[model samples]
Target: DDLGPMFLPCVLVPNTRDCRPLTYQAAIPELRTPEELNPILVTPPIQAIDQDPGILYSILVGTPEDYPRFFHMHPRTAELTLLEPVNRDFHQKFDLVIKAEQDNGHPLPAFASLHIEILDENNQAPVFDPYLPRNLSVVEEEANAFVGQVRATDPDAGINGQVHYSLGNFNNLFRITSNGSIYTAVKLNREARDHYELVVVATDGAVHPRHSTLTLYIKVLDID
Candidate 1:
């Protein structure tokens, strides 16, 4: 009996993670800058099945007024397309409803939820906190003393947002660790150098990483 429309079952292929049943209703795909077209490279495209020959497929966004139009579907081909690339830092998930309607006398509509999940990329560079006090003080002739900590924040997710600290000028006087802690490698005399400007670098964990630099002022305090 020809009653209503139903979504077609997805075909399974070994070693391919793209194709799955419509029940999953979610796609975890990577999106790079200037990404256009369909990001999901599935074996079988998302489709709808009906007893009637003619069915028109369309996508309905939940909040069409407030949200940006990022997804589009072919009315005849039942193919989904991403209009543009989206940043995960701004918006991470997109919820949509795929509707199918018969063109014949019986115009019954069927709906299925489609979810698009955006993964993270190294889009943002690590930025040091601006409110941090850049000026540090250390007693003269102090060896291996803790100065101050430097923290950098990245808007990216996971490893892309993770920052490791290092000294740009790795000399014998100062040292910095992966944890953003600065230490004095050797004792400093106020007469030799009153103040030292240290360059601290923060880098993300990407193949081609994004980095930033911040200068710290270390003042040598006089011993009483």
Candidate 2:
């Protein structure tokens, strides 16, 4: 058998003295990671071999222009680790190019590709934009009258970003729908009360949901 230099596997070739580029045994693995603060280890460590025993092997890593600097690789051992957390919202994918080279100039360097997919997390909270008007008016002596709507937005992905609307201190005078529409729960009299104060609550669709609050002023328009 032509099993030349059966050390740590991969990049194996015939036991010839001719200089050949480094080789990888199998396909490169694609990695997936969640947006986290702690460092993570990569599985199935990358291995590269050179047939010629006269030279030593080391690894080098490269990334795209706009890619985040989050990967670390041991030059001598070819082991990989993450240096920083990957953000799913900022960048979803990362393409990395790894090369195996030797100290001597005999063999050409070999290149391989590593792909990473980032996953989303509940990191962002729902926000009620400041530009949205908070003051609304409803004619007096009317029940279940449409006042106005309040909206909030979240930047997280999927259900984690969905905002749900509710009322905080309605006092049975006002009520808010799931979509942020406000309506009168009871008839309003201008002589009794010309203005009312309310609180709108915004929550995201996460297991431990994030919340935001907005104050609303309702004017009771006169009909007399």
Candidate 3:
């Protein structure tokens, strides 16, 4: 939820006496995301309207010039435009204030606050741990008896993190379950092969499928 910036206007009365707190007020038009992402554009820039004849706008706690790096605005229109990507993490939330003021830098009630919340998109892929054991042993004609997961994981949350499995090399020679249990498709005749190098592919069903491969050297014992 990268909301370029979140601002709430505050009205501050002119005070020449001493310390004062900002008074609340409110500014906007809908902003386009434009990435797949603000306001299209307007003459004289949207911010121009915010400037009343002799009043000027100043950003609190930060520089107004710095706003352009992430968004755009009009000096008179009060319209805010997103200029680029934004972040909402603890380290990068847009927290600032825009205030209307007198020529000599005196405070006025009109002011705005800013903060943003960037939503997460499906941008990550699944991954498999590299520390698991790599082989299985059973009689040549033994049936697939192992059960449960093979240890593949996706870092994403919810459905994006749900992982599945697939094997491409041993057609009709082996089978795998959604939970990742590798079983014998049929009893293998050692005469048919000695050591079966099985490739276990771990994958996920997300916006974009992600995968990992595990090679299990299946050693089949030839016994009656």
Candidate 4:
């Protein structure tokens, strides 16, 4: 129709074949990572920095990929993977989005967003905040007495939930203090065995270490 508003449908709706439309600048700088809450270790390699080399990245997964049952992206290295396992007290944070383009006939794409925070790496092993078979009653010639104080529950935080109070399986007349108070270092003689099954261990100083055990029952009343 004389160079009109149509030319073979713009080359059959291909539009010149290529345009290289995918640039980046900001909005790609919001990331917080700390993942390891019993992850089965599938495709766990989440690392993404300011990667802008003429744009050749691609990613889009969320509800219907249903996160692919979780998460994973590496068709061309957008570098995001975490295929399963995470319970930071029932999910801490995960505001995700990944999109970038320029890999052939795939253009007109530019997006970036991330916020995965599940940090608290003590591995959750030290716990005992009134969570155990505990019941005390001392009266058999109580001396140097001070019984009652047990609080140790580590969901992980600072020093990996710093806690250390050991005396696992009975004791030398009972004695422990690092903030789990249970005294009587050999001055309580209800025959010393009327009842005394102490084993309170909550160690989580991190690094190849984790513990949480509770059991303290002392009952011996004869000095009424």
Candidate 5:
């Protein structure tokens, strides 16, 4: 009676814990000593339906020392695969054994074991302030014209907060800095136009990008 290939469910035994000796009520106040012998219950029992011909498949175990690590599944067999190796230690490998039973109409006992591993998730996107700075000013025709700058701030660290600026919508009139500092690229003339408007945007690099914009108004003054 050959049963079709099947997948079996796996489980760990009693929760694993750091080596510690049992404490006594009377000795509660006294300094405790490390357990004379500490052993880890590594291998978990494997249980599968007797009617099913599927193999024990495979056993995946994670090291207690490694953190932020995960396992992947094989594409074809869907077997457990390690993403990252455990820290350098004496005990890194785990042993796996499989046992078979008679295929008669009799019931079988259950198997149990424990496997512990750490996993990591993607990082969150950075955040930027909604309110940005837009400056505008004008000077006399003969005197030097003062073009204003745009400024923004990001509340993220590293490349996430790094910012670059460029002219937006309007012609080349202003420039911005990596540090969120904005300056005028050209001088302004009151005779030409007393006022001007500009749009600026700030962005952050993350899973989700954040941005902010502001419009600047400039006024020109007449010479005496």
Candidate 6:
């Protein structure tokens, strides 16, 4: 057994050696085989024998056919415990802890020394927030008028939390920053694009990531 060592009990029989003391050696068979070695009592054996010790030492060998079984059956189950239930109804963001045991009454010993990892689920979808001003009015053929700025927030960590911006359909009229900030990249003309439709996407960089999209409506002002 991987647990530890197990010692057996033995007794010494008297012999013709000065009647001083007798010792007996108990032989243990190899663990792989079921054969048992017979112990012989000798006169003045090299080692002393203790008879019927109060406590018999035994080790827990490998599990027999009777050992209980354990499994991780639930898809939502994790190494940490969940404090609150996860709702898939609406777009929401929350943190949860995984438990070390399964609900099926099985011991999860692997979680004892393992670090709890809370994976980020892409539940929050990006939307156009009216509270965030992203509109602009520019004259025809304007070089660099502040068109508008778009901002977004991601509540994740590491690369999974990174947000990027791009002028989806209005590539020639406008541009965006690598850090999710939008800016005017070129001059705007009513003949080229009287109104511009811009699409922006925010992505979470992970093994299985989440994404959000927003559309910007830009209208050009007529010059008298």
Q: Rate the local accuracy (lDDT) of all candidates.
A: 0.73, 0.66, 0.54, 0.56, 0.41, 0.41
Error of 5 at 162 (Å): 3.7
Error of 2 at 109 (Å): 48
Which residue pairs in candidate 6 collide? 80-98, 80-99, 81-97, 81-98, 81-99
Q: Best lDDT goes to which candidate?
A: 1
At residue 131, candidate 1 shows an lDDT of 94
In angstroms, give how far residue 3 of model 2 lies from its true place: 46
List candidate 2 stretches off by more than 4 Å. 1-120
By TM-score, the better pick of 3 and 4 is 3
Which pairs clash in model 4?
none
lDDT of 1 by residue, 1-224 (tens): 46566666634557893334353244434455335445444334567777446888887655333334666678888766666666665667766777778777576777766766666667899999999899999888888888889999989878888899888884688888778888889888899888988899999986558999999999998887
lDDT of 2 by residue, 36-57 (tens): 3223333344555664543233
Model 3 Cα lDDT, one tens digit per residue, 55-124: 4555555433365576554554455556655443322334456654554434333545444433333446
Q: How big is the positional error of residue 93 in model 5, measured in Å on the Cα after superposition?
A: 21
lDDT of 3 at 28: 19
RMSD (Å) of each candidate, 1 decimal: 8.9, 11.5, 12.4, 15.2, 17.0, 22.0
Which candidate do you rate higher for TM-score, 5 or 6? 6
Q: What lDDT tens digits, residue by residue, belong to model 4 across residues 1-224? A: 11111111112225664323222211110122326422222222322223222344444643233445455656554555565655555555455555655444435454544445554445578768765448887766666587666878777677777888888865767778898888776566666567877778888886546987788787866775
Which 10 consecutive positions of candidate 1 have the poorest summed lDDT? 17-26
TM-score leaderboard ranking: 1, 2, 3, 6, 5, 4
Which candidate do you rate higher for lDDT, 1 or 3?
A: 1
Between prediction 2 and prediction 5, the one with superior TM-score is 2
Among all candidates shown, the one with the greatest TM-score = 1
